[PDB]
Amino acid sequence: RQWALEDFEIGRPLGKGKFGNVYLAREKQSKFILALKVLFKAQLEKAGVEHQLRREVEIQSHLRHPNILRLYGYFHDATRVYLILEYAPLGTVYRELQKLSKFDEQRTATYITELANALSYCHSKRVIHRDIKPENLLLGSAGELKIADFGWSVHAPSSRGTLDYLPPEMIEGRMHDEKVDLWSLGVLCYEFLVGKPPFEANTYQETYKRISRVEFTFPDFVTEGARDLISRLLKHNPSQRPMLREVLEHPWITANSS
Numbered sequence: 001r002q003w004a005l006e007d008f009e010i011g012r013p014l015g016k017g018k019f020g021n022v023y024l025a026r027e028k029q030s031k032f033i034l035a036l037k038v039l040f041k042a043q044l045e046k047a048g049v050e051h052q053l054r055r056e057v058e059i060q061s062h063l064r065h066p067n068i069l070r071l072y073g074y075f076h077d078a079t080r081v082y083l084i085l086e087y088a089p090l091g092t093v094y095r096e097l098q099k100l101s102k103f104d105e106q107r108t109a110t111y112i113t114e115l116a117n118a119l120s121y122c123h124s125k126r127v128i129h130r131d132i133k134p135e136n137l138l139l140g141s142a143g144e145l146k147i148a149d150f151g152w153s154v155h156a157p158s159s160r161g162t163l164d165y166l167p168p169e170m171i172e173g174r175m176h177d178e179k180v181d182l183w184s185l186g187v188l189c190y191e192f193l194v195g196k197p198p199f200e201a202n203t204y205q206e207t208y209k210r211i212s213r214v215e216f217t218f219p220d221f222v223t224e225g226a227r228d229l230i231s232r233l234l235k236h237n238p239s240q241r242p243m244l245r246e247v248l249e250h251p252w253i254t255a256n257s258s
């Protein structure tokens, strides 16, 4: 409400969103570089997602953690909603994975620790992110992971692209809690080591079946300790999924995390 578009110089697009685009921007008085996530009112209204968005703002604005992207504020005009975000200068984990094909165990373990810590803080406030995926994981100036895109975040317990990161309970439209993010963590650990998520398929229908069945195999290069942690996280039964305390203390994480 205090901020308006006239307060910012707009730079290049940083990435595209479902309901608009994110741009690099600079606040005129302070010269503060930040990111402006621009969303079109007509598209949000058509999707009936105005309430979710109010919630993305409300949830993210109260989070304060070095591995969680900051949301400084918002404003809106006749056609758009603007979220004022911390700029993540090293881009997405998505792009790094495309470039490198797969990460080594040390880079994987480090990212998994940073994510587990950010998720521990979230779950302490009963906040479920629910959209943990590489395009929503950004990199700070020191290459540290930052959980971003709280677009689908909710307070636990609750109801609501590809299904690749979604657990069975969310896929079936059943009730879910914080355990959904533990499943996504297992999908991500596999994807970082293998280069593709474990339930990846040509069609949505084939992916749905693979998730429902928890039907996946590891390539031979995946180590025993990596197989153990992934297998523990990818449990059909949410209750069976470990606590984040356990993920951080896991022998493969403690041995490879930097």
Ligand SMILES: Nc1ncnc2c1ncn2[C@@H]1O[C@H](COP(=O)(O)OP(=O)(O)O)[C@@H](O)[C@H]1O
Residues within 6 Å of the ligand: 014, 015, 016, 017, 018, 019, 020, 022, 035, 037, 069, 085, 086, 087, 088, 089, 091, 092, 135, 136, 138, 148, 149, 150, 151
């Ligand atoms: N703060 C940021 N700094 C740098 N790039 C960003 C930032 N926020 C978003 N992006 C880029 O824009 C993309 C879309 O942003 P995101 O918040 O995930 O939107 P959506 O909810 O539409 O998926 C990201 O995947 C990333 O490439």
Ligand SMILES: Cc1c(C(=O)NS(=O)(=O)C2CC2)cc(-c2ccc(Cl)cc2)c2cc[nH]c12
Residues within 6 Å of the ligand: 040, 041, 042, 044, 045, 050, 053, 054, 057, 074, 075, 076, 077, 078, 079, 081
């Ligand atoms: C129509 C309208 C308004 C709205 O109240 N607009 S107004 O000021 O009454 C009118 C002169 C423009 C507000 C929002 C909105 C703003 C901030 C957040 Cl975080 C979430 C939602 C949305 C989203 C889609 N449509 C919206």
Ligand SMILES: O=C(O)[C@@H]1CCCC[C@H]1C(=O)O
Residues within 6 Å of the ligand: 017, 018, 019, 020, 039, 049, 050, 052, 053, 056, 149, 150, 151, 152
């Ligand atoms: O921030 C957004 O673009 C949206 C807000 C409304 C719910 C869906 C959400 C998304 O992240 O896709």
Ligand SMILES: [Mg+2]
Residues within 6 Å of the ligand: 135, 136, 149
């Ligand atoms: Mg996103």
Ligand SMILES: [Mg+2]
Residues within 6 Å of the ligand: 131, 149, 150, 151, 152
């Ligand atoms: Mg989103």
